[PDB]
Amino acid sequence: SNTQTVLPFTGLNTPSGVAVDSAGTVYVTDHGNNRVVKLAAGSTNQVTLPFTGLNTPHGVAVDSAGTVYVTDHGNNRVVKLAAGSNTQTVLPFTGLNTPSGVAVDSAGTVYVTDHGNNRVVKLAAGSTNQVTLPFTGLNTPHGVAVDSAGTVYVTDHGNNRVVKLAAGSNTQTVLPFTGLNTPSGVAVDSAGTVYVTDHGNNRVVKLAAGSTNQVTLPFTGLNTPHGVAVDSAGTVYVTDHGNNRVVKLAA
């Protein structure tokens, strides 16, 4: 599509992360209001999730059961909230410094970009021993995403590149993006196409699996965009952080 749609979120301030679940519900970290909000696919009615004590939150992720994970960036922690619950759980990630992106795979493993420590860390479901992924040479990384095979994609923001690591591998691969500047969010669809918020260039770019030639998506009027997400229909959602809005583009 050539026409983008501004979603009916309300009162957003410098929003950051965005995620979409398999039912099409859109979750957005409303960073400047210390809250996470959502819009179901069949709704125009925004709902605030009952997190508490958040401070400049960044990334957001959601699993199949509707459990929502948020990077509580200002408090150096990751918090999760089961659907409809008034219990939030601080995950046992330790030593975080200004953490940014968060992702969760089909097995419940949670991945966090520990931006201030130039590393990406993970916790398996129920685990209390955090594992640092053996990425090398990261500098101020931002976004993280995980595909259906457990391959982990990180936005190496300080080096203007996107790096991936297969599950269990010690050898990262730098994806053949070019011309990125301070990239932020990353997402991956079921065909392995990788979407990156090229934040410094106010655009979203995509790269198909096995391709070495990215293309810019026809979003318009973005300003310092942050998060990106893609649903099962190929619709792409971007947090237009500088314009306090979330925009979507159908394939």
PDB file of C-alpha atoms in Angstrom, residues 138-222:
ATOM      1  CA  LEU A 138      28.170  -4.325  19.777  1.00  0.00           C
ATOM      2  CA  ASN A 139      27.959  -0.611  20.544  1.00  0.00           C
ATOM      3  CA  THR A 140      24.841   0.921  22.146  1.00  0.00           C
ATOM      4  CA  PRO A 141      22.523  -1.769  20.702  1.00  0.00           C
ATOM      5  CA  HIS A 142      18.813  -0.974  20.666  1.00  0.00           C
ATOM      6  CA  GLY A 143      16.219  -3.339  19.226  1.00  0.00           C
ATOM      7  CA  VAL A 144      15.982  -7.117  19.440  1.00  0.00           C
ATOM      8  CA  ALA A 145      13.722  -9.640  17.707  1.00  0.00           C
ATOM      9  CA  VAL A 146      13.514 -13.427  17.551  1.00  0.00           C
ATOM     10  CA  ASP A 147      12.096 -15.527  14.735  1.00  0.00           C
ATOM     11  CA  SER A 148      10.271 -18.862  14.823  1.00  0.00           C
ATOM     12  CA  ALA A 149      13.561 -20.801  14.681  1.00  0.00           C
ATOM     13  CA  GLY A 150      15.020 -18.900  17.642  1.00  0.00           C
ATOM     14  CA  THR A 151      17.423 -16.823  15.574  1.00  0.00           C
ATOM     15  CA  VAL A 152      18.058 -13.541  17.391  1.00  0.00           C
ATOM     16  CA  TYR A 153      18.349 -10.212  15.540  1.00  0.00           C
ATOM     17  CA  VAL A 154      19.835  -7.128  17.207  1.00  0.00           C
ATOM     18  CA  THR A 155      20.090  -3.535  16.023  1.00  0.00           C
ATOM     19  CA  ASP A 156      23.740  -2.571  16.570  1.00  0.00           C
ATOM     20  CA  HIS A 157      22.796   1.089  16.753  1.00  0.00           C
ATOM     21  CA  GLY A 158      26.262   2.538  17.407  1.00  0.00           C
ATOM     22  CA  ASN A 159      27.696   0.698  14.388  1.00  0.00           C
ATOM     23  CA  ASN A 160      24.755   1.264  11.996  1.00  0.00           C
ATOM     24  CA  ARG A 161      24.241  -2.446  11.393  1.00  0.00           C
ATOM     25  CA  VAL A 162      21.955  -5.371  12.191  1.00  0.00           C
ATOM     26  CA  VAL A 163      23.493  -8.593  13.500  1.00  0.00           C
ATOM     27  CA  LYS A 164      21.934 -12.022  13.940  1.00  0.00           C
ATOM     28  CA  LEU A 165      22.851 -15.152  15.876  1.00  0.00           C
ATOM     29  CA  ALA A 166      21.270 -18.561  15.399  1.00  0.00           C
ATOM     30  CA  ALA A 167      20.209 -20.411  18.534  1.00  0.00           C
ATOM     31  CA  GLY A 168      23.263 -22.051  20.079  1.00  0.00           C
ATOM     32  CA  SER A 169      25.714 -20.459  17.638  1.00  0.00           C
ATOM     33  CA  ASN A 170      28.867 -18.586  18.622  1.00  0.00           C
ATOM     34  CA  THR A 171      29.305 -16.978  15.176  1.00  0.00           C
ATOM     35  CA  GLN A 172      27.193 -13.921  14.432  1.00  0.00           C
ATOM     36  CA  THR A 173      26.249 -12.769  10.934  1.00  0.00           C
ATOM     37  CA  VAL A 174      26.089  -9.110   9.920  1.00  0.00           C
ATOM     38  CA  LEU A 175      23.077  -8.584   7.678  1.00  0.00           C
ATOM     39  CA  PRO A 176      23.733  -6.826   4.322  1.00  0.00           C
ATOM     40  CA  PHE A 177      21.962  -3.574   5.135  1.00  0.00           C
ATOM     41  CA  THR A 178      23.573  -0.385   3.848  1.00  0.00           C
ATOM     42  CA  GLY A 179      23.145   3.280   4.657  1.00  0.00           C
ATOM     43  CA  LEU A 180      21.545   2.847   8.078  1.00  0.00           C
ATOM     44  CA  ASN A 181      22.042   5.630  10.601  1.00  0.00           C
ATOM     45  CA  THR A 182      21.386   5.087  14.329  1.00  0.00           C
ATOM     46  CA  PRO A 183      18.903   2.258  13.644  1.00  0.00           C
ATOM     47  CA  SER A 184      16.440   1.454  16.416  1.00  0.00           C
ATOM     48  CA  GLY A 185      13.669  -1.136  16.229  1.00  0.00           C
ATOM     49  CA  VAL A 186      13.873  -4.470  14.447  1.00  0.00           C
ATOM     50  CA  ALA A 187      11.219  -7.022  13.529  1.00  0.00           C
ATOM     51  CA  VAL A 188      11.119 -10.277  11.567  1.00  0.00           C
ATOM     52  CA  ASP A 189       8.160 -11.904   9.816  1.00  0.00           C
ATOM     53  CA  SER A 190       7.382 -15.570   9.194  1.00  0.00           C
ATOM     54  CA  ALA A 191       9.285 -15.575   5.877  1.00  0.00           C
ATOM     55  CA  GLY A 192      12.419 -14.296   7.605  1.00  0.00           C
ATOM     56  CA  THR A 193      12.146 -10.790   6.161  1.00  0.00           C
ATOM     57  CA  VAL A 194      13.849  -8.349   8.535  1.00  0.00           C
ATOM     58  CA  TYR A 195      12.394  -4.874   9.117  1.00  0.00           C
ATOM     59  CA  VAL A 196      14.519  -2.124  10.662  1.00  0.00           C
ATOM     60  CA  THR A 197      13.595   1.342  11.870  1.00  0.00           C
ATOM     61  CA  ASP A 198      16.348   3.419  10.262  1.00  0.00           C
ATOM     62  CA  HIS A 199      15.834   6.040  12.938  1.00  0.00           C
ATOM     63  CA  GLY A 200      18.501   8.528  11.812  1.00  0.00           C
ATOM     64  CA  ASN A 201      16.977   8.615   8.308  1.00  0.00           C
ATOM     65  CA  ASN A 202      13.299   8.773   9.374  1.00  0.00           C
ATOM     66  CA  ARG A 203      12.442   5.611   7.446  1.00  0.00           C
ATOM     67  CA  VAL A 204      11.725   1.896   7.784  1.00  0.00           C
ATOM     68  CA  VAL A 205      13.644  -0.531   5.568  1.00  0.00           C
ATOM     69  CA  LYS A 206      13.195  -4.235   4.890  1.00  0.00           C
ATOM     70  CA  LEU A 207      15.452  -7.047   3.700  1.00  0.00           C
ATOM     71  CA  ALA A 208      14.144 -10.392   2.507  1.00  0.00           C
ATOM     72  CA  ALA A 209      15.788 -13.628   3.578  1.00  0.00           C
ATOM     73  CA  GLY A 210      18.712 -14.394   1.294  1.00  0.00           C
ATOM     74  CA  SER A 211      18.616 -10.886  -0.200  1.00  0.00           C
ATOM     75  CA  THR A 212      21.466  -8.372  -0.153  1.00  0.00           C
ATOM     76  CA  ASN A 213      19.385  -5.405  -1.379  1.00  0.00           C
ATOM     77  CA  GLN A 214      17.106  -3.668   1.113  1.00  0.00           C
ATOM     78  CA  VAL A 215      14.168  -1.462   0.175  1.00  0.00           C
ATOM     79  CA  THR A 216      12.608   1.501   1.961  1.00  0.00           C
ATOM     80  CA  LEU A 217       8.932   1.129   2.848  1.00  0.00           C
ATOM     81  CA  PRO A 218       6.635   3.952   1.678  1.00  0.00           C
ATOM     82  CA  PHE A 219       6.041   5.520   5.079  1.00  0.00           C
ATOM     83  CA  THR A 220       5.974   9.321   5.063  1.00  0.00           C
ATOM     84  CA  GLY A 221       6.498  12.101   7.565  1.00  0.00           C
ATOM     85  CA  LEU A 222       8.263  10.019  10.201  1.00  0.00           C
TER      86      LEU A 222
END
